[PDB]
Tab-separated table of C-alpha atoms and ligand atoms in Angstrom:
chain	number	residue	atom	x	y	z
A	1	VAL	CA	-24.148	4.868	3.560
A	2	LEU	CA	-25.281	8.021	5.289
A	3	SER	CA	-27.331	10.435	3.195
A	4	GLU	CA	-26.206	14.002	2.827
A	5	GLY	CA	-28.939	15.010	5.278
A	6	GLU	CA	-27.588	12.576	7.886
A	7	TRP	CA	-24.009	13.796	7.399
A	8	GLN	CA	-25.199	17.382	7.985
A	9	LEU	CA	-26.717	16.368	11.326
A	10	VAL	CA	-23.441	14.715	12.381
A	11	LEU	CA	-21.153	17.528	11.390
A	12	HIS	CA	-23.485	20.114	12.808
A	13	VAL	CA	-23.090	18.609	16.291
A	14	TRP	CA	-19.393	17.976	15.746
A	15	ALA	CA	-18.765	21.714	15.208
A	16	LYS	CA	-20.133	22.208	18.723
A	17	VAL	CA	-17.844	19.470	20.068
A	18	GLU	CA	-14.980	21.363	18.509
A	19	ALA	CA	-15.816	24.321	20.762
A	20	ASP	CA	-14.315	22.374	23.653
A	21	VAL	CA	-12.511	19.291	22.428
A	22	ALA	CA	-10.664	18.965	25.748
A	23	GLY	CA	-13.748	18.986	27.972
A	24	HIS	CA	-15.441	16.548	25.624
A	25	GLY	CA	-12.479	14.202	25.402
A	26	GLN	CA	-12.264	14.035	29.152
A	27	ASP	CA	-15.885	13.240	29.775
A	28	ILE	CA	-15.821	10.544	27.113
A	29	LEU	CA	-12.700	8.750	28.398
A	30	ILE	CA	-13.903	8.946	32.074
A	31	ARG	CA	-17.286	7.573	31.003
A	32	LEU	CA	-15.590	4.750	29.121
A	33	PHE	CA	-13.263	3.868	32.025
A	34	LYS	CA	-16.033	3.983	34.635
A	35	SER	CA	-18.581	2.034	32.562
A	36	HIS	CA	-16.093	-0.559	31.316
A	37	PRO	CA	-13.143	-0.832	33.755
A	38	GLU	CA	-11.474	-3.468	31.607
A	39	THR	CA	-10.760	-0.718	29.007
A	40	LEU	CA	-8.568	1.227	31.489
A	41	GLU	CA	-6.257	-1.814	31.700
A	42	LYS	CA	-5.184	-1.293	28.016
A	43	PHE	CA	-3.462	1.997	28.992
A	44	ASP	CA	-0.205	1.561	30.886
A	45	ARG	CA	-0.078	5.397	31.200
A	46	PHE	CA	-3.495	5.575	32.960
A	47	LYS	CA	-3.617	2.324	34.981
A	48	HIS	CA	-2.739	4.120	38.212
A	49	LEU	CA	-5.911	6.203	38.126
A	50	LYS	CA	-8.268	4.839	40.745
A	51	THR	CA	-11.072	7.360	41.256
A	52	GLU	CA	-13.114	9.652	39.053
A	53	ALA	CA	-11.548	12.686	40.855
A	54	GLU	CA	-8.056	11.422	39.998
A	55	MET	CA	-9.175	10.952	36.389
A	56	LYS	CA	-10.558	14.487	36.291
A	57	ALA	CA	-7.281	15.901	37.578
A	58	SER	CA	-4.903	14.129	35.120
A	59	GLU	CA	-3.530	16.524	32.497
A	60	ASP	CA	-2.163	13.603	30.443
A	61	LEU	CA	-5.626	11.995	30.313
A	62	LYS	CA	-7.087	15.322	29.041
A	63	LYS	CA	-4.289	15.416	26.401
A	64	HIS	CA	-5.167	11.931	25.096
A	65	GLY	CA	-8.811	12.891	24.938
A	66	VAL	CA	-7.899	15.676	22.501
A	67	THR	CA	-5.800	13.206	20.472
A	68	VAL	CA	-8.723	10.869	20.124
A	69	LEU	CA	-11.412	13.440	19.206
A	70	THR	CA	-9.047	15.084	16.723
A	71	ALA	CA	-8.513	11.829	14.842
A	72	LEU	CA	-12.265	11.094	14.945
A	73	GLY	CA	-13.190	14.557	13.634
A	74	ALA	CA	-10.713	14.172	10.794
A	75	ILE	CA	-12.521	10.989	9.810
A	76	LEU	CA	-16.057	12.237	10.229
A	77	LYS	CA	-15.246	15.230	7.973
A	78	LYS	CA	-14.424	12.817	5.123
A	79	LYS	CA	-18.059	11.821	5.110
A	80	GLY	CA	-17.210	8.149	4.493
A	81	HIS	CA	-14.237	8.705	2.185
A	82	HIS	CA	-11.888	8.022	5.106
A	83	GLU	CA	-9.593	5.269	3.800
A	84	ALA	CA	-6.209	7.015	4.342
A	85	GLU	CA	-7.275	8.167	7.802
A	86	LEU	CA	-8.785	4.931	9.057
A	87	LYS	CA	-6.144	2.519	7.923
A	88	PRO	CA	-3.209	3.613	10.164
A	89	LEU	CA	-5.583	3.773	13.112
A	90	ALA	CA	-6.873	0.185	12.570
A	91	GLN	CA	-3.371	-1.112	12.045
A	92	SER	CA	-2.082	0.368	15.315
A	93	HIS	CA	-5.132	-0.492	17.425
A	94	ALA	CA	-5.185	-4.078	16.184
A	95	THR	CA	-1.485	-4.899	16.205
A	96	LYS	CA	0.079	-2.461	18.664
A	97	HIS	CA	-2.579	-1.588	21.224
A	98	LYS	CA	-4.537	-4.861	20.873
A	99	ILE	CA	-7.994	-3.323	21.082
A	100	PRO	CA	-10.926	-5.682	20.411
A	101	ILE	CA	-13.684	-4.325	18.180
A	102	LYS	CA	-16.014	-4.564	21.194
A	103	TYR	CA	-14.229	-1.719	23.000
A	104	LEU	CA	-14.858	0.487	19.973
A	105	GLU	CA	-18.551	-0.137	20.475
A	106	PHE	CA	-18.146	0.894	24.118
A	107	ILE	CA	-16.402	4.170	23.276
A	108	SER	CA	-19.081	4.855	20.647
A	109	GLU	CA	-21.790	4.617	23.291
A	110	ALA	CA	-19.738	6.920	25.531
A	111	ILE	CA	-19.476	9.475	22.668
A	112	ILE	CA	-23.208	9.374	22.198
A	113	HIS	CA	-23.898	9.718	25.915
A	114	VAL	CA	-21.677	12.792	26.281
A	115	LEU	CA	-23.022	14.521	23.093
A	116	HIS	CA	-26.456	14.070	24.502
A	117	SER	CA	-25.446	15.600	27.879
A	118	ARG	CA	-23.788	18.621	26.439
A	119	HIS	CA	-25.909	19.409	23.373
A	120	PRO	CA	-29.625	18.541	23.819
A	121	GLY	CA	-30.969	21.070	21.411
A	122	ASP	CA	-28.572	19.947	18.759
A	123	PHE	CA	-28.783	16.273	19.506
A	124	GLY	CA	-32.396	15.124	19.297
A	125	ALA	CA	-33.332	11.595	18.120
A	126	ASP	CA	-32.717	12.295	14.430
A	127	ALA	CA	-29.162	13.566	15.135
A	128	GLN	CA	-28.527	10.671	17.595
A	129	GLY	CA	-29.664	8.265	14.824
A	130	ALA	CA	-27.263	9.806	12.290
A	131	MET	CA	-24.357	9.816	14.780
A	132	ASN	CA	-24.908	6.090	15.498
A	133	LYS	CA	-24.862	5.308	11.800
A	134	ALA	CA	-21.566	7.250	11.389
A	135	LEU	CA	-19.953	5.443	14.319
A	136	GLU	CA	-21.246	2.089	12.905
A	137	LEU	CA	-19.650	2.836	9.563
A	138	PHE	CA	-16.377	3.683	11.392
A	139	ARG	CA	-16.550	0.388	13.316
A	140	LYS	CA	-17.448	-1.630	10.191
A	141	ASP	CA	-14.516	-0.323	8.166
A	142	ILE	CA	-12.146	-0.877	11.082
A	143	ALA	CA	-13.457	-4.464	11.461
A	144	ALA	CA	-12.751	-5.174	7.811
A	145	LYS	CA	-9.118	-4.198	8.303
A	146	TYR	CA	-8.887	-6.161	11.575
A	147	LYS	CA	-10.147	-9.228	9.697
A	148	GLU	CA	-7.569	-8.820	6.953
A	149	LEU	CA	-4.745	-8.779	9.474
A	150	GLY	CA	-6.156	-11.689	11.469
A	151	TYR	CA	-7.539	-9.921	14.544
A	152	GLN	CA	-11.200	-9.558	13.635
A	153	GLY	CA	-12.752	-8.609	16.947
B	201	HEM	C1	-13.042	6.647	18.858
B	201	HEM	C2	-12.009	5.645	18.709
B	201	HEM	C3	-10.614	5.897	18.888
B	201	HEM	C4	-9.780	6.688	18.157
B	201	HEM	C5	-10.094	7.630	17.013
B	201	HEM	C6	-8.467	6.348	18.584
B	201	HEM	C7	-7.382	7.104	18.219
B	201	HEM	C8	-6.131	6.999	18.783
B	201	HEM	C9	-5.018	7.738	18.339
B	201	HEM	C10	-5.077	8.734	17.185
B	201	HEM	C11	-3.923	7.316	19.019
B	201	HEM	C12	-2.448	7.666	18.870
B	201	HEM	C13	-1.722	7.166	17.629
B	201	HEM	C14	-1.662	5.629	17.557
B	201	HEM	O1	-0.924	5.042	18.358
B	201	HEM	O2	-2.370	5.023	16.721
B	201	HEM	C15	-4.378	6.286	19.878
B	201	HEM	C16	-3.560	5.613	20.757
B	201	HEM	C17	-4.051	4.678	21.681
B	201	HEM	N1	-5.367	4.196	21.676
B	201	HEM	FE1	-6.889	4.801	20.633
B	201	HEM	N2	-8.471	5.409	19.614
B	201	HEM	C18	-9.746	5.105	19.765
B	201	HEM	C19	-10.209	4.054	20.559
B	201	HEM	C20	-9.444	3.365	21.414
B	201	HEM	C21	-9.946	2.505	22.460
B	201	HEM	C22	-11.400	2.185	22.660
B	201	HEM	C23	-8.865	2.051	23.163
B	201	HEM	C24	-8.785	1.290	24.352
B	201	HEM	C25	-9.957	0.785	25.077
B	201	HEM	C26	-7.781	2.646	22.574
B	201	HEM	C27	-6.493	2.447	23.026
B	201	HEM	C28	-5.357	3.171	22.552
B	201	HEM	C29	-4.030	3.015	23.188
B	201	HEM	C30	-3.807	1.905	24.247
B	201	HEM	C31	-3.205	3.969	22.678
B	201	HEM	C32	-1.771	4.275	22.978
B	201	HEM	C33	-1.752	5.066	24.267
B	201	HEM	C34	-0.349	5.473	24.644
B	201	HEM	O3	0.170	6.404	24.012
B	201	HEM	O4	0.288	4.834	25.504
B	201	HEM	N3	-8.105	3.524	21.526
B	201	HEM	N4	-5.778	6.081	19.737
């Protein structure tokens, strides 16, 4: 459970992210796809994208970045009370998209890398520690629902 002090650190950086959701989404998804190429193969709509420059130029990729960060922000702002938000997401990513829990660890590390690049002063070690904890909670609740449905991992 995150303390109230840790939630403040998370949401304080997230307000910055919300200044430019689209730029953030894009960096995060390009980072994910470059670091872990096997993740790009889950997206039929992005599989044709071969270079970083092509990724940077795709308007549809930038659109999906916004989609992702908007659903994440809606969860983070629940400060743990995110049951109604998390449960449709787990259901679809387990049963429809077929995303292993491991890829959610990957995209968490991408989110932390980009936050660190764009917001030093607001993302020191204490903030980075609270953001990790939040993402771990997110991943742990998703994994419980995966397990239920018979996909755990
Ligand atoms: C920070 C974690 C993530 C969030 C909040 C999230 C959120 C979303 C949302 C809200 C949608 C659209 C509605 C739906 O179909 O459920 C979606 C679709 C999708 N997500 Fe995620 N997702 C995340 C991580 C991942 C990862 C890591 C992968 C793949 C490596 C992934 C693959 C997909 C796919 C394949 C689609 C459908 C794309 C299409 O429209 O063709 N998601 N995700």
